[PDB]
Write a protein that binds this ligand. Structure first.
Ligand SMILES: Nc1ncnc2c1ncn2[C@@H]1O[C@H](COP(=O)(O)OP(=O)(O)OP(=O)(O)O)[C@@H](O)[C@H]1O
Ligand SMILES: Nc1ncnc2c1ncn2[C@@H]1O[C@H](COP(=O)(O)OP(=O)(O)OP(=O)(O)O)[C@@H](O)[C@H]1O
Ligand SMILES: Nc1ncnc2c1ncn2[C@@H]1O[C@H](COP(=O)(O)OP(=O)(O)OP(=O)(O)O)[C@@H](O)[C@H]1O
Ligand SMILES: Nc1ncnc2c1ncn2[C@@H]1O[C@H](COP(=O)(O)OP(=O)(O)OP(=O)(O)O)[C@@H](O)[C@H]1O
Ligand SMILES: [Mg+2]
Ligand SMILES: [Mg+2]
Ligand SMILES: [Mg+2]
Lengths: 752, 449, 172, 58
């Protein structure tokens, strides 16, 4: 219902663009039953609508090879209509078409180069001799002949805009040649089709800026005036300015663009004069659309603004938008990343009555954006855009354009051997070999990362699930935690329960909590934000909670996102136990975390994982299910886990076969993962020492240690110490036993 | 302007956005602005010499006006264009719908009763949105790319009560456009147990707005403040969500430290703005999640810090005292640490009603387990009564975690079955008793004795 | 041929002394395009509207002489985050930058380069794709890179035979 | 000041109390002081220009 204004409904005029076998520039061919349906005879002049306010005229001809539901047209008519193969256009009879008295055509500059002969004599005169071709202003038509075929721009038609080129019509090629770059910029013009995702938002925008102009009779009959104020808000890169360009390109209404800072002037009352001039220009030009980009630049809250000029500008905009002298059918659009920064009086019905959230697209929306951005790119057959759409979790559309550009840049890099930077031009063979493969898109995906997270980017040391020894159940739980809600939301909908999104790792130091976080950051298919505990805290009042709010907002925007706190007890500590801690800054941070984690806001796929070295001091409300649902205890490894840890540490290390890791794991009772890693590091250091002494010996004789050996491991072991003392295990086991005995039932069985 | 008004007398001079050219001269840092304020003062003083000129000014920031301009002899009369009541909203709706083609089933009285915080521009927006929905219902019959419309389509076009109901669903007061948050669709039947709390909240919301005359007759003012205190996860924020979704009152939900700002004087201004926009949308509910961040005990942390939190709590106390009973602004606070709430906040007249949301008992646990599993396919042999029996110390969050763990176990089983079927080529209709049995061993009691 | 627009925004970041301004000067000298240099504080003015007008004039000058390279040194001074900035002038300057680099009218052939010691102090809207496409980290050089730097800086000086630049590179 | 000193190319600039004018850009909340530090950095970069102007700060 909301998107009902987007359907075409397959009217008889609707036809699918298809390639032309022999159709010339000025003619198109249809199927005979299609003409009989439309009551069109052969040779009748016809009018074809296109995208972005374009129309063309052609001579309809009967072609049996042409499909029933398709219209054949060559590249010239497609480029005139700004349409591609598969596009739907409407064909209608054009009445009262008369022979053109005179037509003025301007050739393209790049085509006329290399042609000594007169453009009119060589091309125009024979092409338009008894042509009887219908043409319209703005069309490009290409004429073959000479060394290079010549493209002409029909700038002037008499009568305008439709005319038949009769032999008596005078054709003249004089004039400034049209730049190729200008026509190229005309071709790559943004329409409503260039916006991917935002289908409901685009539907509302078309309802408000297109429908009242196309069918004002609806609003006139129903006795209401349509909305005239649209505020586009959203995070950066979601496509607000893109929608503004699309509206500017695809409206018949006069378009006036206002950029916030451009309004400002040093003179007294000159900025208000600029605003008044803009609104007067819009009113003078009948239906007009005013778009104010960066609205927060010139529309701050008057209560929060110190300068008098800015407050006067806000008041001037308030009066122009809705004052005693009302607007004369003028649509005002605005775009901002900070809708709450705007003045509250501008947001009412009189001024900005509709607020449109151009939000972060989902998987299908970003697949659509990728298709839009790659429609022009040369792709190999191996490229799968659906996989790339599934991989890019937090991308907004500018990030997808970045990914496509990175893929193309990598494709160009792969040809830097055949290409020479210095040479004048590139060989045609290299150009033909140039394409964007799925490997380039995979590389771009690897480099890709949502822009909103650019500030929260940390270099992670590339840990894999294999690098961690033991903790197999914890690995499975983490993988399922991050993967199930993301890859199988339908299962959760079928069982009608939201996923749990909270995990707290607690245990003795050096047992693998941060290692698990690294494995998640490198392996799990979601965005990852790493937070050291105290980095959010700030000296200023209310800014630590602002940092908490901002980081949770970044995790929400980049969802699915994993939000890891390396030291939770620093940022999350029990309330009321601090005599100082500022004006209760730590307690306010605790409460802000509580609200952000479980409050009245709608829950998103934000997986919040915290690692604490001592969980008894964390606030009890933090551990409440719905916040850190699962409290996972990472204890000292047992003998099997110690074998796994020793193998994982020495997997990349060349170790002699005589070394028995089972015996090491048997002896090292109470050792943590860091302890065993230190044993391996000490063995490596001893081997390096022996190799260095051997090299010194060879140097002395001039003027050994292929792998770590058994004696190296023994000498490393004699230094080994048990880092975690028995009382520490006692404390952690105490917390774990409190957690276990909280349930009260070792085995739960349903009565039969 | 004033001379031309005198030339053509009797004259009226309308000054829209008076605060644009008439701020307080003490706060002004521009010489030309101060000279303009002085010129306005001089002209309005000399207005007495002028025969029949009358100056009317409009502003939505009356406090920003220079005080001298509000004295005797100059702008001495002030008219408060306030928020309309139910009958006034009905009149505004009648005015705006006079030209539209309403159907017979429309009932503007209901629409007037629903719009609790609308001011007249909001009602115009509501009418426009209803008509736009009516036009949308015909977008199937008429395409936008169509050049013209059949006259029968126009003849059928009309606004019905369903369109107005859709508009009311979308309609919200313009003032509450910055405080608006996405709230999950929580319903009273989503909450299990807490029946006395539900009834008390429903009465405390409905009785003051519907029947103030009885309270005036008996001479007792209705309680305008409620605090929720209890163990974490027992249903305070859930009750707030249910109040937001179900009650016909505007809801303002603010996080605790949302108001605090480093710039001196801004946190008090934030409290003033939130309370003022609560008054403008009355009947309104102003919910303070994690109240202890907003309101902590004074003097406990006075020495450590600049003292801005004390100013914030003093401003909050001033706003709680400043409300008249005629404005129906219910204030609800939630905290799981009532022991650190400032004692002044609980004093009579402010947050009077203190409600203990306790750890649920066996019947309440049955209700919670049924409410959570209401939309879930659960096997018949799964006995919820035994689950309530065994989870003695569990809270509502704990039971929800048990159900979620059972759901995840079922999803894991289904995923593994699908993987196995794909493997053999190259299930789990509902949650079962074994799933809950496995989920119960992971279960823990979150709140200690 | 490949159907993309090459990236138009470069943000050089790193600790002081890495050579961001040096790389900007090298690009200015060795490229066949018009070069415009902007310093952060020099844009600032007391009068409202002067600084945005200076930015507009610089970008218009680059657009006329296109293709062009605009280098904005000390981007952190000129472009703080608008949420964390109190002054209206700075916020309007950031908005003017946002509009100039990516607005309804897009720059056809102008390359915008910037250097900043603290990239995280930049407004996140600038670190978006369309404006500052890529961020390049000019970091601390390794031993061989700093040996190359020593060779560059010692080429003009006359050096005795005993001078061993690899040792100096190892020690520093 | 730098332009005026460079005009009289045999010049010595003396910046007394440089600590007040030039704090840490990150450490100080004030944006005026971070901007003045950046401007001083820019002036020092182009200060030499193979000119007799020298700068001494206290
Ligand atoms: N939904 C989308 N579909 C297709 N392309 C998109 C979409 N959103 C953004 N883009 C592309 O990514 C870039 C985003 O720039 P744009 O000016 O449209 O963003 P914006 O939302 O206005 O950002 P800002 O808030 O910083 O002004 C453009 O190159 C645009 O073509
Ligand atoms: N299961 C494991 N497998 C392999 N190495 C491990 C394992 N557990 C710990 N380590 C080793 O421990 C070191 C890092 O430990 P990590 O950072 O994961 O500890 P932690 O539990 O987060 O401790 P802390 O409480 O001190 O923050 C590395 O040398 C890593 O190899
Ligand atoms: N009576 C109940 N019926 C149904 N679900 C409940 C009930 N009480 C709690 N829950 C569920 O358990 C969790 C408790 O969250 P809720 O927002 O109600 O907690 P709270 O009382 O505000 O606690 P906190 O002090 O931790 O903020 C939610 O997932 C909620 O859906
Ligand atoms: N990578 C380098 N290779 C060679 N010389 C270098 C390098 N980095 C710095 N230098 C030398 O040191 C000087 C200082 O470098 P430069 O002024 O570019 O540093 P910067 O920190 O990038 O600058 P700014 O902070 O002003 O942007 C250069 O002019 C050059 O002489
Ligand atoms: Mg924009
Ligand atoms: Mg750690
Ligand atoms: Mg809560």
């Amino acid at each position: 219902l909301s998107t009902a204004i987007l359907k075409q409904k397959n009217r008889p005029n609707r036809l699918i663009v298809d390639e032309a076998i022999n159709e010339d520039n000025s003619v198109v061919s249809l199927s005979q039953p299609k003409m009989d349906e439309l009551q069109l005879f052969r040779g009748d002049t016809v009018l074809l609508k296109g995208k972005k306010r374009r129309e063309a005229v052609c001579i309809v001809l009967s072609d049996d090879t042409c499909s029933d539901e398709k219209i054949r047209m060559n590249r010239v008519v497609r480029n005139n209509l700004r349409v591609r193969l598969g596009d739907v256009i409407s064909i209608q009879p054009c009445p009262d078409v008369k022979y053109g008295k005179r037509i003025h055509v301007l050739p393209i500059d790049d085509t006329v180069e290399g042609i000594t002969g007169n453009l009119f004599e060589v091309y125009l005169k024979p092409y338009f001799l008894e042509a009887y071709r219908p043409i319209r202003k703005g069309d490009i038509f290409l004429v073959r002949g000479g060394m290079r075929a010549v493209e002409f721009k029909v700038v002037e038609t008499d009568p305008s805009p439709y005319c038949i080129v009769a032999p008596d019509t005078v054709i003249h090629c004089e004039g400034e040649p049209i730049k190729r770059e200008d026509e190229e910029e005309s071709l790559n013009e943004v329409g409503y089709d260039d916006i991917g995702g935002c289908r409901k938002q685009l539907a509302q925008i078309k309802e408000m800026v297109e429908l009242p102009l196309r069918h004002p009779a609806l609003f006139k009959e129903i006795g209401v005036k349509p909305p005239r104020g649209i505020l586009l808000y959203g995070p950066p890169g979601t496509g607000k300015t893109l929608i503004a360009r699309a509206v500017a390109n695809e409206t018949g209404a006069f378009f006036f663009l206002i950029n916030g800072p451009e309004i400002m002037s040093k003179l007294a009352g000159e900025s208000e004069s600029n605003l008044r001039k803009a609104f007067e220009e819009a009113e003078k030009n009948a239906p007009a659309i005013i778009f104010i980009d960066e609205l927060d630049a010139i529309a701050p809250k008057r209560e929060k603004t110190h300068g008098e000029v800015e407050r006067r500008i806000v008041s001037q905009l308030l009066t122009l938008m809705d004052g005693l002298k009302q607007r004369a059918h003028v649509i005002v659009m605005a775009a901002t990343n900070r809708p709450n920064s705007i003045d509250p009086a501008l947001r009412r019905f009189g001024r900005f009555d509709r607020e449109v959230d151009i939000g972060i697209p989902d998987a299908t929306g970003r697949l659509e954006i990728l298709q839009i951005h790659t429609k022009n790119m040369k792709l190999a057959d191996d490229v799968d855009l659906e996989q790339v759409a599934n991989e890019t979790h937090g991308h907004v559309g500018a990030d997808l354009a970045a990914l496509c550009s990175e893929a193309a840049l990598q494709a160009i890099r792969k040809k830097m051997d055949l290409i020479d930077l210095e040479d004048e031009t590139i060989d045609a063979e290299v150009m033909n070999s140039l394409a964007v493969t799925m490997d380039d898109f995979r590389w771009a995906l690897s480099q890709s990362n949502p822009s909103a997270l650019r500030e929260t980017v940390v270099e992670v040391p590339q840990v894999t699930w294999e690098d961690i020894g033991g903790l197999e159940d914890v690995k499975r739980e983490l993988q399922e935690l991050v993967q199930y809600p993301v890859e199988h939301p339908d299962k959760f909908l079928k069982f009608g329960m939201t996923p749990s999104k909270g995990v707290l790792f607690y245990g003795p130091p050096g047992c693998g909590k941060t290692l698990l976080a690294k494995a998640i950051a490198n392996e799990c298919q979601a965005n990852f934000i790493s937070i050291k505990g105290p980095e959010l805290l700030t000296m200023w009042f209310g800014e630590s909670e602002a940092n908490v709010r901002e980081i949770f907002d970044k995790a929400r925007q980049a969802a699915p996102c994993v939000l890891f706190f390396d030291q939770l007890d620093s940022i999350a500590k029990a309330r009321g136990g601090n005599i100082g801690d500022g004006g209760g800054a730590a307690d306010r941070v605790i409460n802000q975390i509580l609200t952000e984690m479980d409050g009245m806001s709608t829950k998103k796929n934000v997986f919040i994982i915290g690692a604490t070295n001592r969980p008894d001091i964390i606030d009890p409300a933090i551990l409440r299910p719905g916040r850190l649902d699962q409290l996972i205890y990472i204890p000292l490894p047992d003998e099997k886990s110690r074998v796994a840890i020793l193998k994982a540490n020495l997997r990349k290390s060349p170790v002699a076969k005589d070394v028995d890791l089972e015996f090491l794991a048997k002896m090292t009772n109470g050792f943590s993962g860091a302890d065993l890693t230190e044993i391996c590091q000490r063995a490596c250091k001893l081997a390096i020492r022996e190799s260095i002494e051997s090299e010194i010996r060879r140097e002395r004789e001039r003027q050994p240690v292929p792998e770590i050996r058994r004696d190296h491991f023994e000498e490393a072991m004699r230094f080994a110490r048990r880092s975690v003392s028995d009382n520490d295990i006692r404390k952690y086991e105490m917390f774990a036993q409190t957690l276990q005995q909280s349930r009260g039932f070792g085995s739960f069985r349903f009565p039969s």
